[PDB]
Design a protein around this ligand. Structure first.
Ligand SMILES: [K+]
Ligand SMILES: [K+]
Ligand SMILES: [K+]
Ligand SMILES: [K+]
Lengths: 363, 361
């Protein structure tokens, strides 16, 4: 009957660390008697606990032992497995090598290394699974890029499942990480094999009509050759994979990220020249994203930049040649866990059926 | 605010019964009758069984500051057009705009309404930040003057200032609300390239009011082994097209001359048009991969004069994408911007955020 007000009070508890009963009442404009009644039902269901002059305030927190969630990240070479308490806090994290591209190999890892009957000292055990992918998910949870990998995971685990693009999940993470700065407009820019963007617009993850918003890697740019204008996808020019493939052709050897960093630190001229060009293209890309979306901030997740964070200053310096806008240009706020923790947020929101959980999980 | 909800229902459903309002809002008939009696008492609503927004409560002014004119639209309280006037703009000066406003608008005139002028919307070819500061006005000389403050001082009513493409997107939202297109773009192609963005049924302006300033996107061209970056509005805006045809044909090219030379099948013009159509198709593909809207509404004077070019854009778009995005021309050539302005001032004065009224003239 009071399902909505129970959800509202629970959301306040997630969003405000050790909030008082009276502060919940004030935030929601609901009388103290009704807030006390709602809290008693939430305490009775083991969802919330009380925290251990004049009257002492009653402080509330989410009961981390109510159950746990699993956040999965299906990368190009691994299966990342994160376990989170009901309050979002990290229990443990594991990384498994992915022997090949097969979905069967992913499912084999999930079956072999995840014990779904394990309660991890929680009352209800596994409550839900988030799945992060390097692909496109439509608004009806269909992976569009026999049976979907998410539905295959839903059957193996037998709990609610959410599937989402990795850049979209990282943007949810950045929304909550920078919520204290009120950055209600931001972009999580992903540069790896492709170029992807997680878009936060007016504090909401914007997915577009088909879940393809922020598929910036597919943007077409022209180059006139032999008096013929040819269009190319920007991710075929300056994704990290395109940079490595280009350098493999120029140096006539197989280039890996580790070799690129080594050759760059050694100041190999072919690599230095290509890096200056790559840095310039990314600076122009940030300018273009700013004139299109005009966010408060952009958070770049590029393995090369995470290994050499000083390149952020070269991007910022090159950006100044094109624009005087004060957009915050940053690297990802959490190299290891932004995507995984964004997944934790998405599964919490789905299982609870509560939007705008602003919880900033520190890990 | 149930009083605001009932008023919004009456705006959104022209002639709605007391029982239909009750059903739409899930509020009992007695409370709806009580709310309606207060709204009738305030002269905001009139009876026709059916309820209508009292058009004689007052009126609004919607202004459009174009490159060469000051467009002045008068609207009743229900949004209906009273009249529209167009004044020549002698020069770029903001002082000349204010002189026209002071000379041709009688703010004491009630126009048979009870309260007279209730508010003014101002549409500009430029950037307005979220604090109503005009931060970019390319074809007009500001001279330090605050458009918002100066029009508010002259008219003594609430004033909203907004980008023309943003106002056109607000107009398309109302026009295509029955199709539930909560994500759309109003693409403006004239001297520059601009976009009004509707995201999740709301006008998205960005952190500085610069969202959709797509004309400033930089693209590179290698010349004499040097990579040079250019703003796309300097390459394929309508002005840029006319400029490159002026250099190729060695004569001053106007829109009227372009259409004439195109219909005559002048080879320089026919090839440049095929290239222009292709660049706009790629632009729509790029906007779709960036924003992925339900629909895009293009406002380009060349396309409004030759609407069949929409089919050539749609055909060329299929070479790049299989997406089912609706590609259309503006739903109202003459008044989308002005009527979007009417909507923005109605929403501001009433403090009601999702009004879907669709008048066309
Ligand atoms: K990445
Ligand atoms: K995305
Ligand atoms: K100003
Ligand atoms: K705009």
């Amino acid at each position: 009957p009071m399902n909505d007000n129970e959800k509202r009070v629970l959301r306040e508890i997630y969003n405000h660390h050790n909030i008082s009963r009276t502060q919940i009442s004030k935030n929601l404009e609901i009388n103290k008697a009704t807030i006390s009644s709602i809290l008693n039902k939430l305490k009775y269901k083991s969802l919330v606990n009380e925290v251990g002059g004049g009257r002492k305030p009653i402080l509330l927190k989410v009961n981390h032992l109510y159950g746990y969630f699993i956040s999965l990240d299906l990368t190009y070479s691994s299966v990342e497995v994160m376990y989170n308490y009901f309050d979002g806090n990290v229990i443990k994290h594991e990384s498994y090598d992915l022997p090949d591209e097969k979905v069967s190999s992913i499912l084999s890892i999930i079956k072999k290394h995840i014990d779904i009957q394990e309660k991890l000292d929680t009352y209800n055990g596994l409550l839900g699974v988030s799945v992060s992918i390097h692909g496109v998910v439509d608004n009806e949870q269909h992976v569009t890029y026999g049976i979907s990998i998410a539905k295959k995971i839903k059957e193996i685990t037998n709990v609610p499942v959410v599937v989402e693009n990795e850049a979209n999940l990282s943007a949810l993470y950045e929304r909550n990480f920078n919520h204290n700065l009120s950055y209600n407009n931001l972009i999580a820019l992903s540069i790896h094999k492709g170029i992807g963007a997680g878009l936060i617009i007016n504090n909401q993850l914007y997915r577009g009509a088909n879940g393809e918003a922020g598929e910036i890697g597919k943007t077409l740019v022209s180059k006139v050759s032999d008096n013929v204008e040819i269009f190319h996808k920007i991710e075929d020019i300056f994704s990290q994979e395109a940079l490595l493939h280009n350098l493999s052709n120029q140096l006539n050897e197989k280039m890996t990220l580790s070799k690129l960093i080594q050759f760059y630190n050694e100041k190999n001229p072919v690599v230095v020249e290509e890096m200056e060009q790559f840095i310039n293209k990314i600076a122009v890309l940030i300018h273009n994203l700013n004139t299109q979306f005009n966010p408060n901030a952009i958070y770049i997740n590029c393995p090369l930049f995470n290994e050499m964070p000083e390149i952020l200053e070269a991007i910022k310096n090159q950006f100044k040649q094109y624009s005087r806008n004060e957009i915050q240009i940053k690297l990802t706020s959490n190299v290891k866990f932004a995507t995984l923790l964004g997944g934790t947020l998405a599964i919490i929101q789905k299982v609870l059926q509560i939007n705008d959980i602003y919880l900033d999980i520190k890990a």
